[PDB]
Each structure stands twice: as structure tokens, then as C-alpha cells.
Amino acid sequence: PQITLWKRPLVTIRIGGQLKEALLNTGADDTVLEEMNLPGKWKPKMIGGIGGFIKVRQYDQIPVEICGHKAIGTVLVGPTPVNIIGRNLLTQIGCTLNF
Amino acid sequence: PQITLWKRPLVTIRIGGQLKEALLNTGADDTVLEEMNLPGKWKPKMIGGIGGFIKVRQYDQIPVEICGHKAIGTVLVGPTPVNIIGRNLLTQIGCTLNF
């Protein structure tokens, strides 16, 4: 699909039995979601943006369904103000910027 | 152009006769540049950040050239990790997300 930027590029994503509204975010290296129980080991990480840093848990090899596309990669979990799909998963689904 | 996301979508912009590198950022409502002086008329503003609001200076109706595509709009100046071009200007240059 083609998503214009008149409004926030928000899409529904699925992880397991879980639905989250998430922002397609070319400004983010990583994917960060709030309030998610995820399977597997995790390691502490700190990630920054405007305002400063938050502490997150890094989970690896997490399948994420994005508009019918299967992404599998690193998902960070913590107190992000909005759920974010970053470049690590955007690349896997073939997402580009075009103008 | 078409910009892929294996690397950060950094491009050259021209603003006030200066060339700068900026990140094309679909997760940002607004355009936020690193500390710099800019032509005339700014107002204090606060923008929502990580851990709370950050102070910026808001300049309205500023010409910004992005990969040789002309935009004129609001440019915020403050403490950002990197110069960020947000949807306010991305929309003006006809930028979309595609996959």
C-alpha cells in the first residue's frame, strides 16, 4: 500500500494473540512497544529520542504481523508514549519513502 | 527519490543558505532542528518528549529545501539528537510510505 503523511501513519499490528496500534516510524532504528509480555530471554537496553532515554527490554526473533506482512526481529518493550515500528522491521516488509 | 531504510534516511537540506543533514522521520509530527539561529519571528513552544516536555523555539513560514524539493512551514529549534524532518514538511514535498 501507499501511506500518506497527512496524519500519523498508524497501523494495526499483531503479535501472537495481541493487537497493538503502532506508528510506522522511519526515524526509529528500533521497534518499541509498551505493555507486552513476550516469550524468551531479554536484556536491558536504553533508547533515546527527543526528551531523553527510556529503559526497555530487548527481545530477539519476535514475529510481528504488519498489514499482512510477516516481520521477525528485535522488539523492545517499555514505556514508550506510542507504539513504534522502526527500520529493523520496516525494511523486512519492503517499506520505502518516496517523493 | 526512493529512499530505503537499511540505513537511516538522512538527506541534505538547505535552510537559510546553510546545508545540513536531516533525518526523514515519519514518526514526528513536527520538524525539529539542532540549535541554530533562523530568520526572524519565533515564539516559545513546548513539545512532548521522552520523560516530559522539551523547550523549543517555533519559527513559522520558513523555506526549507529537501533534496531539491521546496517546502515552506514551521521549523522548531531545540535539543534534538539529530535534525529531524517531520510530516509537516514531508507532506509538502509529496513524501509517502510504500510497501
Partner: peptide, 7 residues
């Protein structure tokens, strides 16, 4: 690391 989104 950087998740540079803004409201």
C-alpha cells in the same frame, strides 16, 4: 538505538 519520533 535512536527512536527519534515526536508528538
Amino acid at each position: 538505538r535512536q527512536a527519534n519520533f515526536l508528538g
